[PDB]
Amino acid sequence: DVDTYLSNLQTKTTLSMIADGLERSARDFDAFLEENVTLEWEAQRKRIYQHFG
């Protein structure tokens, strides 16, 4: 385990890698909003399908 950990290690500050979580969140939020608005359009269409009958 330690062998692979040292093999795949990069010379750089650790506090910068964890920071990437912010970027990843900012890039996931977009897709999450797109899923919100798609499940919303879906819901709306559904309620219309239950309005017409």
Binding site: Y5, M17, L22, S25, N36, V37, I48
Partner: protein, 1641 residues
């Protein structure tokens, strides 16, 4: 029950390093420097408080007496030990010491191998680097220099190891002697006003060792008086070893160097024994010592020839002179000439002890010893012989009056009839004043000045015997100039002007001085005669006044004696002028007295000084005058007359050059004493002003004493400084000293004169101070000038630093010009000092120290603040920085060679227990040089300097600073600081490899020396210093040093092995050091995680438990409880702990081992829930109150003016933002800063700084907990511990939203919080929605968001765009969580009515950045219209949605991303039936058919994958938005709008063709469903009427065959481009197909 546990700890600790034995070197250093922290350290406290150490120091002979401790040695060496045991046995066999002492010395040498190696000659690369730095300064030895490899291979040899062991043994002997001497000194002559801990330790040591209790009216001196013979007997063995080296020692080691070292060690031991004996003797001054001991001591001295046999060599003069002086001192002490004469003349028995006077044998022995010493021809016996001669001269007369035991002596050696021998001895001693000269030399070597060989108290108590001898020899030999100069050199010692301080000391130290005014013999013979012989004999009276004013500053009982003598002198005496022969008449009263009376009205200096007619006088054969006057005014008048270059034939003679210099010097010293005693409580603040007024009395109104000094300077500065004789240079030095003295009480006139002094870059006339440069010889005559000028300049700069105020006659421009000239002169002196040839090194050392301190005070004062207060010295600081950071390449080395030479002289100065003055001066010089280097490095780091030419030289200076600490431990902290600053400058600028300059062996030795953080004492200051140094060294690109410091060559002896030992006791360790330890841990983790995290996981059982303990018992609000400043420290510690936990959790997650650790840690976040994201502890109330109170009392100076310029790393203490270190000296001049009962502005400023530090720690904890929770949200994805997790997340969100509303912190001090804590809650709610574990409690959570959106000033399109966007995303996720859940509709309609509409209108008005904001607002409205509470309040919301007429602006913007977003917005608006029909009205169709987009729509290029961006964009805007809107508006009414949609369909058939053609053997399947529903409804309508829907324009054959052929191969053309972060669509598609089967089938 007195073991050697604390004295000699187990060998396992010494070897493993867990406990460094407190060697005698460290104890001696701590006792010599009188350091508070070290003396109060737990280790040294327990070591000294032990009874074993007491018995050892009370019996040093037993420490080295030959004994048989084989059993103890074997028991200690049993349970690298073989080599240690072998060396111990070899040393015990060679030297007569016991085996235990040998083993201890070997262990100490083993622990101190780093120093022994670093004090060795440097390598070849080091010599090459030094030569490159040099471009005088030839203190190297390249002829014998060798490489490092051959130096290390020879270091590990056997012969060299044994030589080093013997050297360490001798050094430890000297250190033990010095330590016990200093301990006795501090215990007997303890200074008052010391720290409570020091007094308690002194009392404990006394009561434990000697039972000396101060609360007893009569302490037990027995055990203290029995310390004289204990060392007088050991001196025998000392001299025996000095005269004969060990026989058992091998002959190969008995080399010249070893013999010299042994002789020096023996001489030092003898001197220390003599000093301890003298101290134990003077402890009981009046009583006599046991004659049984003096007998043996005099026999010893007789035999050894007063140690002249061992001191006869010419290579031990530096140690012989002080040795001879101390021998004479102890001889005169045990002789007690004063008490002896008192007994011989009084005949009364003292009763303290029997004296040698009752033993004739002792008298015979003393007489024969003195005779042998005088016959041998030695100078050391001069004072002792003279004294004895006096005693015999009094015994003879005592026998003549009685013509009892002493008679036996007087008749044994035939000394009764004849008195020839003692008389001849006294004659020889007094001839040529040899006795007086040797006494003066001894006093110089036994004084208080820096030239003294012992400590100040040692010399103060040693001068007592000489003073008593002069007291007792005054009335015998008549008054004469030689005894007077002798007493002057004794009492004054030749110290400088700046050697005067108001430091209160023990009365004992002041005894030697006060005796001049206590005993009548020394009062009516020296003081009275000195006063009477004035100004005729000026030097004695002047020096006496000087020493008295310097010694009686704190003595309030005799503080006005100098003032009284100077203002009310009883008599006058001056030379007689022949012109006055016709102005006197003899009264014929007494011819022997030669009295007379003035007959004419003599007018002197013809208010002016006038003498009344009829004054009596005595002709001293000059004459004395018995007239009362103020000598100060007459001296000032004489100075004025001499400065005016005017001479009066009918007046008194003018003062001589040396006389004028001494006059001005004594005036300056008295003025300084007055200024120092006035500031102290209980004095008079008008003392210096009154003194100056008296000095300027009876003088011309147009000038004062200051003007007199100005005229003197102007007259003496006419010629070139080089063309000046000695005395004129002494006069110039004294006038500069007087200017320095007057700078305090009258800064205005001093600055006004310095503005035109014409001596520093003033004008082009000859006399400038910069012309004294070159390759000259700065002897004592020429050095007293510059050494005073530099200090005068430093005082001027210090006075100018106080720009917040006495100052009549000055201005900003004048002070700025004077400061610039002073800086130029100081820089010229610093550049020229590298060429002068001084008589000694101490002078150059003092000069370098002074100039470096001046430059450092100038540099720090410029960057410490950024307000206008630091503008007076700004041109000067700027000049010095431009000249020390980017100098020209031709004179670049001239400014750097001085520092290199200083470092060389420091790194090759030998260790010596004597001469503490030179040692402390060199230490202060080194510390000043290091501070100056640090200041230059920080200045270069600031202002954006990309190329620092000084770094190349600072690297080769660190090459020497790596070994410099080996000579003195004091340098360990400053040096490290410098290194830290060099590393910091190397970071913000790979850097030059430091290993290439240091070296492998040298670097490893330095690492092994510094790795232990102040182990023998364990102080906090040097600990924080070494932890910041380690953190800075690790943070930079240093990799070799970082690896050698972390690994130790895992870690077994590395810094981390001790950092873990300190971390496992944080519950009791000082919070101040814990912060630095945690900072070091974080610096080692972020850059070297693979090692630190690995070691912590391998030893987590000791760290995780302590972290949990700290977390559980960490209250949130600690201000209210006991402790106010510890709150910030605890917050910083918690922040660092949270950061480390987060980093290790990230590493474990990367290793997939973070589940259990995170699950165990989440239960420790209580302190976080208490004092985490909540930053409301800013308490702006008290800050505003302090600001108002400071602006009301200080209109000119503001509270923000004390803001730091970020020059030095801000401390997390009472000086985080406000510069207190400078304020203490800047605002403490007027009443209000000090305050009663420790109140005022100081305490409030300290509380404000503590609050700011607490806020900074809270922000750090905020970031740490943000990262921790961000990673935990991903870690804790499974369905467990959901309750506590959601509770914690919701509490954090609520605290953030509440802080966003409550009082905000300032933006100039801290970073703007806007957009810093919004994304935190944003991502938290994001992940919680992804997990779908919310309690749908938005009923209260949204109120804070609404209040924030209302009270944000609506910066929709302002600079605060990130803040607006994050608030919008937060409210979006909040309303989405609410949708998942009635009392909600009334609470969420506020956003639909006031927020969405206002923001949309603002965006539509600005757009005339915008795309993303409009899309976010559209998404917000879409997700908000989905709450269940809106499906019933549609009626209520129709009016609010119609009031703003948003549809008009939407259609306007639609008339192409903006059109897309407007279309989506109107679509989501149509989600409500009323709004659906409103959009379905003809308002829509008009623009739908008139839109300019129809231009691109009619073109056949439309398509989903069309190459053109416009075509694809239009196709998407039509597919994703137009069809749902069509269906929505058809739901309202279809029968009426069917013609319209039919016409739209046949007007643009290209869209239908593209939709039915792309799909061949998803957002388009929704289109198919919409078309199917439209077909169904239009067919149902057409079934009744035929007028409408003329053509369907739609095919069933093709579409049916398509849906047939599309119901694994489906993945052929499924390449989703948009979503790439997340089975997804197939289900939806099949659903739509079912819908088709439900509408078409």
């Amino acid at each position: 029950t007195l073991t050697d546990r604390t004295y000699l700890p187990p060998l396992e600790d010494c070897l493993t390093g867990r406990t460094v034995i407190l060697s005698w070197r460290l104890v001696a250093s701590a006792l010599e420097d009188a350091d508070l922290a070290r003396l109060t350290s737990p280790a040294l406290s327990t070591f000294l408080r032990d009874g074993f150490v007491h018995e050892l120091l009370k019996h040093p002979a037993r420490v080295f007496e030959p004994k048989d401790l084989k059993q103890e040695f074997e028991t200690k060496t049993s349970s690298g030990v073989d080599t240690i045991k072998k060396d111990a046995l070899w040393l015990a066999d060679a030297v007569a010491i016991n085996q235990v002492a040998a083993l201890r010395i070997v262990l100490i040498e083993y622990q101190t191998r780093a120093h022994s190696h670093l004090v060795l000659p440097l390598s070849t690369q080091d010599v090459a680097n030094i030569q490159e730095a040099a471009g005088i300064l030839s203190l190297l030895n390249p002829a014998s220099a060798v490489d490092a490899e051959t130096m290390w291979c020879d270091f590990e040899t056997e012969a060299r190891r044994r030589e080093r062991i013997l050297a360490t043994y001798l050094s430890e002997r000297r250190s033990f002697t010095a330590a016990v001497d200093a301990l006795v000194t501090f215990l007997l002559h303890s200074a008052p006003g010391q720290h409570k801990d020091l007094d308690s330790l002194r009392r404990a040591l006394l009561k434990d060792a000697f039972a000396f209790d101060e609360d007893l009216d009569v302490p037990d001196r027995s055990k203290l008086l029995t310390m004289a013979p204990t060392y007088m007997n050991l001196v025998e063995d000392c001299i025996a070893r000095a005269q004969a080296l060990p026989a058992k020692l091998g002959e190969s080691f008995k080399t010249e160097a070893f013999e010299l070292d042994w002789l020096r060690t023996a001489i030092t031991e003898a001197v220390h024994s003599l000093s301890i004996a003298f101290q134990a003797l003077d402890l009981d001054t009046p009583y006599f010592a046991p004659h049984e001991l003096l007998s043996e001591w005099f026999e010893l001295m007789n035999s050894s020839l007063f140690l002249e046999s061992i001191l006869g060599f010419e290579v031990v003069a530096d140690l012989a002179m002080p040795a001879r002086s101390l021998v004479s001192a102890i001889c005169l002490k045990m002789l007690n000439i004063d008490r002896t004469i008192q007994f011989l003349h009084d005949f009364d028995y003292p009763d303290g002890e029997e004296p040698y006077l009752l033993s004739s044998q002792t008298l015979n022995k003393i007489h024969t010893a003195v005779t042998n010493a005088v016959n041998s021809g030695v100078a050391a016996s001069l004072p002792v012989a003279f004294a004895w001669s006096l005693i015999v001269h009094q015994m003879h007369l005592g026998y003549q009056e009685r013509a009892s035991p002493y008679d036996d002596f007087l008749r044994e050696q035939r000394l009764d009839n004849d008195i020839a021998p003692v008389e001849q001895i006294a004659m020889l001693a007094t001839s040529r004043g040899q006795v007086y000269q040797v006494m003066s030399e001894m006093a110089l070597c036994l004084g208080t000045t820096h030239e003294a060989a012992f400590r100040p108290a040692v010399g103060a108590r040693a001068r007592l015997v000489f003073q008593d001898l002069l007291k007792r020899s005054a009335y015998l030999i008549p008054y004469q100039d030689e005894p007077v100069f002798s007493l002057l050199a004794i009492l004054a010692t030749g110290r400088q002007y700046w050697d005067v301080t108001d430091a209160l000391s023990a009365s004992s130290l002041n005894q030697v001085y006060t005796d001049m005014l206590d005993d009548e013999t020394l009062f009516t013979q020296f003081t009275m005669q000195a006063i009477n012989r004035f100004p005729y004999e000026f030097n004695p009276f002047s020096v006496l006044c000087r020493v008295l004013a310097a010694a009686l500053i704190t003595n309030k009982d005799k503080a006005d004696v100098v003032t009284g003598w100077l203002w009310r002198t009883p008599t006058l005496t001056v030379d007689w002028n022949p012109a006055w022969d016709r102005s006197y008449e003899l009264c014929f009263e007494d011819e022997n007295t030669n009295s007379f009376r003035l007959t004419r009205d003599v007018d002197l200096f013809g208010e002016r000084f006038i003498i009344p007619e009829g004054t009596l006088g005595r002709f001293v054969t000059t004459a004395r005058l018995e007239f009362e006057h103020s000598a100060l005014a007459l001296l000032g008048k004489r100075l004025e007359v001499k400065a005016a270059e005017e001479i009066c034939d009918s007046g008194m003679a003018p003062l001589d050059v040396d006389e004028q210099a001494e006059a001005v010097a004594m005036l300056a010293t008295v003025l300084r004493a007055e200024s120092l005693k006035s500031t102290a409580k209980g004095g008079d603040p008008e003392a210096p002003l009154k003194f100056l007024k008296e000095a300027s009395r009876l003088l011309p109104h147009n000038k004062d004493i200051l003007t007199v000094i100005s005229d003197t300077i102007d007259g003496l500065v006419e010629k070139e400084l080089l063309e000046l004789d000695g005395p004129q240079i002494a006069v110039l030095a004294s006038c500069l000293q007087f200017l320095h003295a007057a700078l305090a009480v009258c800064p205005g006139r001093v600055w006004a004169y310095m503005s035109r002094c014409a001596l520093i870059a003033g004008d082009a006339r000859p006399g400038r101070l910069s012309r004294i440069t070159g390759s000259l010889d700065m002897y004592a005559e020429r050095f007293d000038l510059l050494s005073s000028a530099v200090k005068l300049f430093a005082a001027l700069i210090d006075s100018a630093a106080c720009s917040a105020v006495p100052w009549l006659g000055t201005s900003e421009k004048i002070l700025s010009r004077v400061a610039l000239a002073i800086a130029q002169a100081a820089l010229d002196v610093y550049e020229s000092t590298t060429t002068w040839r001084f008589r000694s090194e101490l002078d150059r050392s003092i000069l370098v120290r002074d100039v470096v301190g001046l430059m450092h005070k100038l540099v720090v004062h410029a960057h410490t603040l950024s307000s206008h207060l630091t503008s007076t010295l700004s041109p000067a600081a700027a000049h010095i920085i431009s000249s020390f950071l980017t100098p020209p390449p031709s004179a670049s080395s001239l400014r750097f060679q001085p520092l290199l030479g200083t470092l060389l002289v420091a790194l090759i100065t030998p260790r010596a227990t004597l001469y503490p003055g030179q040692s402390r001066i060199l230490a202060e010089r080194v510390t000043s040089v290091l501070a100056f280097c640090t200041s230059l490095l920080r200045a270069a780091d600031f202002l954006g300097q990309t190329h620092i030419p000084l770094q190349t030289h600072l690297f080769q200076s660190a090459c020497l600073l790596a070994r410099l600490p080996a000579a003195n431990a004091v340098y360990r902290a400053p040096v490290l600081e410098l290194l830290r600053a060099l590393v910091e400058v190397a970071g913000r600028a790979e850097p030059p490899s430091l290993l290439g300059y240091l070296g492998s062996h040298a670097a490893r030795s330095f690492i092994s020396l510094v790795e232990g953080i102040d182990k023998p004492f364990g102080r906090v200051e040097h600990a924080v210093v070494t932890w910041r140094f380690f953190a800075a060294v690790i943070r930079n690109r240093q990799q070799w040093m970082a690896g050698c410091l972390l690994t130790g060559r895992v870690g077994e002896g590395s810094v981390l092995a001790a950092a873990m030992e300190r971390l496992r006791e944080v519950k009791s360790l000082d919070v101040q050091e814990a912060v630095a330890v945690m900072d070091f841990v974080v610096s080692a983790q972020n850059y070297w995680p693979w090692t630190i995290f690995a070691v912590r996981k391998e030893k987590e059982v000791v760290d995780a438990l302590r972290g949990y303990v700290r977390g559980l018992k960490a209250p949130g609000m600690v201000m209210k409880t006991d402790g106010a400043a510890a709150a910030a420290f605890q917050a910083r510690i918690a922040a660092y702990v949270a950061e480390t936990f987060a980093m290790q959790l990230y590493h474990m997650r990367q290793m997939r081992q973070a589940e259990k650790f995170a699950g165990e840690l989440v239960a420790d976040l209580d302190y976080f829930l208490r004092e985490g994201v909540m930053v409301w502890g800013y308490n702006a109330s008290l800050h505003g109150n302090f600001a108002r109170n400071f602006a009301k009392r200080f209109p000119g100076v503001e509270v923000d003016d004390f803001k730091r310029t970020m020059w030095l790393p801000r401390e997390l203490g009472k000086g985080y933002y406000y510069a207190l270190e400078v304020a203490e000296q800047m605002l403490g001049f007027d009443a209000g800063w000090g305050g009663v009962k420790q109140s005022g502005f100081r305490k409030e400023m300290e509380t404000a700084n503590l609050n700011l530090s607490l806020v900074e720690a809270q922000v750090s904890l905020f970031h740490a907990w943000e990262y921790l929770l961000l990673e935990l949200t991903l870690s804790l994805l499974p369905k467990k511990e959901n309750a506590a997790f959601a509770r914690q997340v919701l509490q954090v969100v609520e605290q953030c939203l509440e802080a966003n509303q409550r009082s905000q912190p300032p933006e100039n001090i801290f970073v703007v919080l806007g957009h810093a804590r919004a994304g935190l809650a944003l991502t938290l709610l994001q992940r919680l929605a992804d997990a779908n574990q919310l309690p749908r409690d938005v009923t209260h959570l949204l109120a804070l968001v609404s209040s924030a959106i209302h009270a944000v000033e609506n910066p929709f399109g302002a600079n605060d765009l990130p803040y607006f966007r994050t608030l919008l995303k937060i409210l979006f996720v909040v309303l989405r969580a609410a949708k998942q859940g009635v009392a909600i509709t009334q609470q969420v309609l506020t956003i639909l009515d006031r927020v969405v509409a206002r923001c949309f209108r603002a965006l539509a008005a600005l757009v005339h950045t915008a795309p993303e904001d409009l899309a976010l607002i559209t998404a917000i409205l879409q997700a908000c219209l989905s709450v269940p509470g809106i499906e019933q309040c549609q009626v209520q919301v129709l009016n609010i949605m119609a009031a703003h007429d948003v549809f008009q602006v939407a259609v306007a913007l639609f008339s192409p991303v903006y059109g897309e977003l407007a279309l989506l917005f109107l679509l989501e608006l149509s989600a409500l039936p009323a709004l659906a029909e409103h959009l379905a009205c003809d308002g829509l169709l008009g623009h739908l058919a008139a839109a300019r987009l129809a231009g691109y729509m009619r073109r056949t290029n439309v398509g989903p994958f069309a190459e053109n961006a416009g075509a694809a964009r239009c196709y998407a805007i039509w597919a994703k938005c137009l069809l749902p809107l069509l269906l929505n508006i058809l739901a309202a009414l279809g029968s009426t709008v069917a013609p319209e949609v039919a016409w739209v369909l046949n007007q643009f058939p290209n869209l239908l063709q593209s939709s039915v053609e792309r799909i061949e053997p998803l957002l388009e399947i929704s289109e198919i469903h919409s078309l199917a529903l439209l077909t169904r409804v239009l067919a149902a309508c057409r079934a009744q009427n035929a007028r409408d829907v003329p053509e369907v324009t739609w095919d069933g054959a093709k579409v049916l065959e398509c849906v047939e052929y599309w119901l694994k191969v489906l993945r052929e053309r499924l390449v989703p481009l948009g979503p790439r972060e997340v089975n997804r669509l197939e289900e939806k598609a099949v659903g739509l197909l079912v819908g088709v089967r439900e509408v078409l089938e």
